[PDB]
């Protein structure tokens, strides 16, 4: 019983997150985000241990719901005749990273480093749980402005992580790698690293580097803002045209630009409060 | 001056 277990409030973000409504868990006044997905619009389906057929999004959210705070936590879900309803945590106060970068401009590298590090830890958590997000971008990242903690959201384009080739893709094209543009094929981890290079450029330059397919595959990265040589090198390495030339997550986090990261609380106190 | 936009999935 959903309408009894949750007080349902108004639409969140005027539909920009999808059909997501503000909610309160009546059990303990916990704030929640109530996300509705139409069965007729569901791309991939998965099975649960109970054999129940559910959207893949629910399968992936359950697999990463270990309580590690860098990904959105699925608290519960319901099936309806024509839809599924997902009960997600609702941290407050938050701003998504797209709006944050729009309002602040290019981020100071100390702040970009803290944010990027936390995204890397969150993506590592996903992969360790068998989950490939496939839509890493600033729009899909929430900033907890009080705690200085980032949360990866919207697993609706994701997949179970596999080591074999992917031939389908439903994430954001301007964050997708050149092997997808050219061949409609990619491997999960190196495609993720490409999207992280796009995200890092986005943070330190104030917008993403590429808008057109020709720029994605062209292999030239022009820096529109002052960016340190070490950060430029990491970005260009993540944006290597050939997937095997890109760094692993270990190589990214061992990169010189990534050292001496701020703690989440330090990040909030220096940059967000 | 340059236009920054969201990109749907
Ligand atoms: N105050 C406030 C406002 C907006 C939000 C985002 C709510 C949200 C979370 C996750 C998803 C998803 O996974 O797709 C979607 C939406 C949170 C808190």
**Do both A49 and A141 map to the same domain?**
no
Comparing alpha-carbon positions, the chain B residue that sits nearest to A202 is B4
The reply to whether A187 and A264 lie within a common domain is yes
Q: What are phi and psi of A226, to 5 degrees?
A: -65, 115
Among residues A44, A72, A92, the one where a domain terminates is: A92
Nearest residue in A to B7, CA atom: A172
How far, in Å, are A45, A59, A61, A78 from residue A50 at the CA level?
14, 12, 16, 14
> Is the same domain home to A85 and A100?
no
Structural domain that includes position A272: 93-273
Q: A62, A92, A122: which is the final residue of a domain?
A: A92
Same domain, A167 and A239: yes
Distance from the B5 Cα atom to the nearest Cα atom in chain A, whole angstroms: 9
For ligand 1, atom 17, the nearest C-alpha belongs to A90
CA distance B7 to chain A (A): 7
> Do A59 and A102 share a domain, yes or no?
no
Q: Tell me whether B8 touches chain A (CB under 8 Å).
A: yes
Method by which the model was determined? X-ray
Cβ distance of A156 and B7 shorter than 8 Å: no
Are A22 and A111 found together in one domain?
no
Question: Do A184 and A70 reside in the same domain of the chain?
Answer: no
How many beta-carbon contacts under 8 Å exist across A and B? 20
- Given A58, A92, A126, the domain boundary residue is A92
A191, A242 contact by CB (below 8 A): no
Experimental resolution (Å): 2.0
Number of domains in chain A: 2
């Amino acid at each position: 019983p959903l309408e009894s277990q949750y007080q349902v409030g108004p639409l969140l973000g005027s539909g920009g997150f999808g059909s997501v409504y503000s909610g309160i868990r009546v059990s303990d006044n916990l704030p929640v985000a109530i996300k509705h997905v139409e069965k007729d619009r569901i791309s991939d389906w998965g099975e649960l241990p109970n054999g129940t057929r559910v959207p893949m999004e629910v399968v992936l959210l359950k697999k990463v719901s270990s309580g590690f705070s860098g990904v959105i936590r699925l608290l519960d879900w319901f099936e309806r005749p024509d839809s599924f309803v997902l009960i997600l945590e609702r941290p407050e106060p938050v701003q998504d990273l797209f709006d944050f970068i729009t309002e602040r401009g290019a981020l100071q590298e100390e702040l970009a480093r803290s944010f990027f590090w936390q995204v890397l830890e969150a993506v590592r958590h996903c992969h360790n749980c068998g989950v490939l997000h496939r839509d890493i971008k600033d729009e899909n990242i929430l900033i907890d402005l009080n705690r200085g903690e980032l949360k990866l959201i919207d697993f609706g384009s994701g997949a179970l992580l596999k080591d074999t080739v992917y031939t389908d893709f439903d994430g954001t094209r301007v964050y997708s790698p050149p092997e997808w543009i050219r061949y409609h094929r990619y491997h999960g981890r190196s495609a993720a690293v490409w999207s992280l290079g796009i995200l890092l450029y986005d943070m330190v330059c104030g917008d993403i580097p590429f808008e057109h397919d020709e720029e994605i595959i062209g292999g030239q990265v022009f820096f529109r803002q002052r960016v340190s040589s070490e950060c430029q090198h990491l970005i260009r390495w993540c944006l290597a045209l050939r997937p095997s030339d890109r760094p692993t997550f270990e190589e990214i986090q061992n990169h010189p630009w990534m050292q001496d990261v701020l703690l989440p609380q330090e990040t909030a106190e220096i940059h967000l409060h | 001056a340059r236009k920054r936009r969201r990109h749907p999935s």
